[PDB]
Design a protein around this ligand. Sequence first.
Ligand SMILES: [Zn+2]
Lengths: 98, 141, 173, 297, 213, 58, 272
Amino acid sequence: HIEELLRNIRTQVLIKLIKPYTRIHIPFISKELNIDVADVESLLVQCILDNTIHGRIDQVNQLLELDHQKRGGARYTALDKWTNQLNSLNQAVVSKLA
Amino acid sequence: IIFKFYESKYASCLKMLDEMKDNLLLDMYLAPHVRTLYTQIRNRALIQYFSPYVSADMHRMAAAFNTTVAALEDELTQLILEGLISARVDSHSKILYARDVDQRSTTFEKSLLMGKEFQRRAKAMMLRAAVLRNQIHVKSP
Amino acid sequence: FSFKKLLDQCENQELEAPGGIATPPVYGQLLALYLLHNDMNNARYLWKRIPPAIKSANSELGGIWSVGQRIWQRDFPGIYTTINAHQWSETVQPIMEALRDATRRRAFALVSQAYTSIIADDFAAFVGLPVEEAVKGILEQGWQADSTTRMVLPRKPEQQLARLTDYVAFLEN
Amino acid sequence: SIDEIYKYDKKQQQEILAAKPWTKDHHYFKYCKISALALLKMVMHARSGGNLEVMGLMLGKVDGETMIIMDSFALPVEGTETRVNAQAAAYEYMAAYIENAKQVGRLENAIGWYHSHPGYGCWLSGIDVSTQMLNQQFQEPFVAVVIDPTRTISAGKVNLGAFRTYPKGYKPPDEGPSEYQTIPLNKIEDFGVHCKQYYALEVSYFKSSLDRKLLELLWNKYWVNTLSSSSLLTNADYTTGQVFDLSEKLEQSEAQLGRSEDKLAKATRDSCKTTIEAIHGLMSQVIKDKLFNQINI
Amino acid sequence: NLLEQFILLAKGTSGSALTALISQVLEAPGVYVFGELLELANVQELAEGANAAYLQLLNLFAYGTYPDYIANKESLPELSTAQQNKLKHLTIVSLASRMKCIPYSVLLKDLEMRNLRELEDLIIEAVYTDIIQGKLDQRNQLLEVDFCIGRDIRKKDINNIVKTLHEWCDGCEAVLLGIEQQVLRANQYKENHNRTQQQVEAEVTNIKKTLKA
Amino acid sequence: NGFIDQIDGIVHFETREALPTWDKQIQSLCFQVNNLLEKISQTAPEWTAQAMEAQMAQ
Amino acid sequence: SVSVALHPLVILNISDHWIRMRSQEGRPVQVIGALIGKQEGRNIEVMNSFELLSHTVEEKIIIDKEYYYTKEEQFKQVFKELEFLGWYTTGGPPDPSDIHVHKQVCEIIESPLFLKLNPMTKHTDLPVSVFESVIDIINGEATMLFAELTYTLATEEAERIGVDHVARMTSTVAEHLIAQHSAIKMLHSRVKLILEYVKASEAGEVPFNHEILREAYALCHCLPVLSTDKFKTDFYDQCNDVGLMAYLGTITKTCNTMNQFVNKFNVLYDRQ
Ligand SMILES: [Zn+2]
């Protein structure tokens, strides 16, 4: 149980650490948590997979880019649905003149 | 195998999966599906490996799947061609970048295309109405 | 400008003026002026419909359909070489004086976004200048060359309120 | 003589209430006069309620066949449009507020109740109809007021309605003009079932003599807020719900085309209204650009 | 209220005392406009004499900018500590009057500064005096101005005010005319469409009636 | 309110979106117009009355 | 000091209170009320108001504290984030009776606002005036005085639409364009007056005032309003979005007309 115990502290520390940032350095996280880079990258992968950290890693630059911006995603979806429905209604109307 | 697939350890999960391949081919209810399952498992690993990453290195990606960059490029091309991975291969530094679709541009493009098709169909229907009204057809004679 | 008016004039004099076949002057003028506007689709048919008697009598027209193939199978050195091969009277001289400028501008516009790093030797053949003269004149536009390897890096260079009311009046009928 | 309406005659009101003309004819009340302050307070409360339904009670009297409304106070209740007779949940508040008002010159009695319909038009649903029947049975005279703040902002016009229901077992004669109103799909059934049991009054607004002077003096610093306000950015979330509802209406329209009466015309009427509002939102911005961003050297 | 206090204090003073009052006015904080002091007869009388330097200084502080104290530095008297800061603040105001997004390079060049920190501190202390209001963007190196005070004017600049107000009046009138025209056209369109619809309906009704034969 | 970018190193405060800023500047310009008119009407009432009664009754 | 953002609902409340009190007594009287709103730092925003009961004994008027506490308990149920700010009344300039009542009000809240509305005014501006209490020591006693504050009318689309509808009292594009034709006509008739004054000062008709001619210069320099490069990308984004929405609307209407014509056609020219 020691590895189970000394892994749920690092998770909460890391979750709190990434709150104010939008782009963070992996070697910077490797200093707060007394772990190497290879361990913090694996911890980030496991956290990102289980819907706990909303971000994505950058391997070639050793980064962590967090998702913070939310553009209008409801207007364009509505416009897509409207376009796709008109594309079928038009065919249904035209086919009546057989 | 299950516990190392779950923990994102594909370097040895696939090797242990391949160690018992010529032991399930002798099974009577599982042999014909060994080809289908083993291909389905690997494709599920490749998508899982490239999921927390926005810019992955293809050398370490190929070294974790017990394959080469040349064959991994073909595998990734096949996966990207269908809607499984939204990624683009950079075959200069061998880097798999994650792409993001622009919702606004896609919406505008598809709406303009729908409008063009609707106008074409409208013109065709008007011509059809004219020919039907005039009763134009070719007689069997 | 003025070449489009000449083009439509030769078109009209080809259609209604003659008794089926027009004079070799206007025929060759139209053939050469189609190439200037980059209308190879029409020029091919113009050459295909020419009777096989003007071709064998006025051979100069056969010369003009020697530049055209070079535009057809895109070959800039071929264009520049073939233009400077033949000569005619004062009917195509200003045609192949604007064709030169059009082709040299087409080459410049072609290698301005298709290429991001091109050998100077190939650029000279593209534009149609000697290499030494090409590189020196490049630097004015801001394209940064790179000597000792000859790798020039081309560098990229009132009623709305009425319309909205018209749309509203239509939607609400 | 404009302020003459503001005078409260207790004896005349008592005589009119005792007579009860309305119990002999079910079509008695035909006019509804609303004060300026009452309308402003109702609109402000409905807007502050957010996307939820807020309700309140309104004070006034009756004069002839006209229902006069002078003030309205909000109630601390939540969950309207789903519970019958929701106002009783704060009945003690009704005692506390009104008994306070009588101390400060507010003598008019309770006359009606109002609630908001954010984004789905003004009408009476089944629960509202039942509550109005109860109120008319136990608190006659009474009137139901329904307000739409989101559509008031979107369309640029006050969307208000005053309705009174018909007694149980009464058959209403003809009266089928049915002025069109855009109703969402998820609530299209409630409008259909309860459509003949209530009739709408003719709504008019009145203001005192001092209100007119203060309002004409107020239109000297308030013209700024007209051409310095953006309508597209305000109701941006309304014309996404509207487009979703329109796209879902087109589903039923096409399904019927493949075969609840001529749904394509109604879907077109909704699409036209939404697009007209959108274009109205851009015409004002074009005008603002022509006035302010085109005066350079 | 400071400038009128100094003007009242300078009702009759002339000569050395007037020059001292001019210097005190130029140094006093909160006085960023000197136009009523310039209109005084005795202040303008300093041109004929040995005190024309102070009149030149006052003109520079009323209509000039800091670079102008780069070519007349030799002729003008020595400038104090707060006087240079006031002139720099007025230069910032003059720059912001033309453009509403002042690059850092322009401010560094005209204000004669070497560091970004010194320039930003000067801009911040200018903002604290409420002569300009704005925000500093450092990624793009811009100063975005939302409001600035109006400096002094000559008698030859009012023509510009008339010129740029005539354009605004004409634009408002032309917008009003277009709005009225659009209203008229829309009403005409609606009336014509319903007249056509009612005529088609009348024709159909007449056809129905005559069909009963 | 803001966020930290650690790559180059910059803390971002509020960004003042363009269109609401445009509306605020329109409000401020109209406020200046109103204040200037009040000042004109206050420092010269006799001329201001004649000027008002030259376009309202025109 | 602080900045005040008044709401027209407060003014309507005061006017209705005064009209009600006058109509029920046959003689104008002075009314007292209470203001509720939100304060964020140094930005006070008066939102709503209610009445208060006052008792006038001998020559001094007092505010009943228990009634105010009852009303606070009542209104905290409905509006939770709104808080007491000050009081209002009707009259001319501030009076010793007002400064006496302000002490009783200040006994409840440290810094209460004072609002005075003149129901019988003679100027051409809104008669609402806002004051705040400033205490001072003089001649060996403490005197409390009133300092005037400048207020601005608050912004809300629902409130603006309601106010416009109440003020006015009587094609859909010919009714929206008139609401924007009555606000430009007010800006134009002010810019024209400023231009006339500037030309009069130039040619010479009124004394040369430097302050006015400096503020006019600043006003002229304020144009154009925000012509940055980022603006003419958001503006065009909005224009193109509305254009696409309009395009889809016309496609839908054309589909409806399509269906109507096809239905009308498959009646006459039907041979099956
Ligand atoms: Zn309801």
